[PDB]
């Protein structure tokens, strides 16, 4: 599968696993509420640190507003409705030098599988 | 004002600044999407690290589903519609021993002002 580099530093790299729907009406815009399912793991250890599929609750956030890590705002902005991808985030687009909480060390590369289910204004 | 200890360890202590609405229909239930405004600062320095009021975008999450730090799930579950509070979170209910990113050191106590605006199923 082709890998799309979403930044020029190779820090956000998306591989589409399931093509979403075409047409502009199926692409989200800044500010829209997007609804996604995701699973995140560390590249180094392969250990999953979080998943919306675990509780079976689609996760919602406002696109491009900094409610989530930078790599997500970049990756989800490139997706269309029903698209499923895997995206590889350098720490710069994740939790940086310090990491976050018990499961994410400083300087960790993150891999997420993200499905864009729907979005609205 | 009364300080309500929402856990027996004193780790989540909520002070109600503005009483919300009474009635069972005005208190959220587990799983409900809650819409809040919040301002979070470090207790030690009083430095604000994150605020939905900044972007003026009310923040939404699904209550009790582990989408947010534990202290928020506990605090918001105790609130009613239109309630505004200040809650003190020990690090156990925040970002723990490791902290998170640049702005939240390990072992930080957090203070959030949280307003419950509305909720729905």
């Amino acid at each position: 599968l082709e890998q799309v580099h979403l930044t020029e530093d190779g820090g956000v790299v998306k591989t589409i696993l399931r093509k979403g729907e075409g047409g502009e009406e199926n692409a989200p815009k800044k500010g829209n509420e997007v609804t996604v399912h995701y699973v995140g793991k560390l590249e180094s250890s392969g250990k999953v640190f979080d998943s919306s599929r675990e509780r079976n609750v689609p996760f919602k956030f406002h696109l491009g507003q900094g409610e989530v890590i930078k790599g997500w705002d970049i990756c989800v902005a490139s997706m269309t409705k029903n698209e499923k991808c895997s995206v590889r985030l350098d720490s710069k687009y994740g939790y940086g030098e310090e990491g976050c909480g018990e499961s994410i060390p400083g300087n960790s590369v993150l891999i997420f599988e993200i499905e864009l289910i729907s979005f609205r204004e | 004002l009364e300080q309500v200890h929402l856990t027996e360890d004193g780790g989540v202590v909520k002070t109600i600044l503005r009483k919300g609405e009474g009635g069972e229909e005005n208190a959220p239930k587990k799983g409900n999407e809650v819409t809040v405004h919040y301002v979070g600062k470090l207790e030690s320095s009083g430095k604000v690290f994150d605020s939905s009021r900044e972007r003026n975008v009310p923040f939404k999450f699904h209550l009790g589903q582990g989408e947010v730090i534990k202290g928020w799930d506990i605090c918001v579950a105790s609130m009613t519609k239109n309630e505004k509070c200040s809650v003190r979170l020990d690090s156990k209910y925040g970002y723990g021993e490791e902290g998170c990113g640049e702005s939240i050191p390990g072992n930080s106590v957090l203070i959030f002002e949280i307003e419950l605006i509305s909720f729905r199923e």
Binding site: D50, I69 | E67, V68, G101
Partner: peptide, 4 residues
């Protein structure tokens, strides 16, 4: 600072 989400998700983690």
């Amino acid at each position: 600072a989400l998700p983690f």
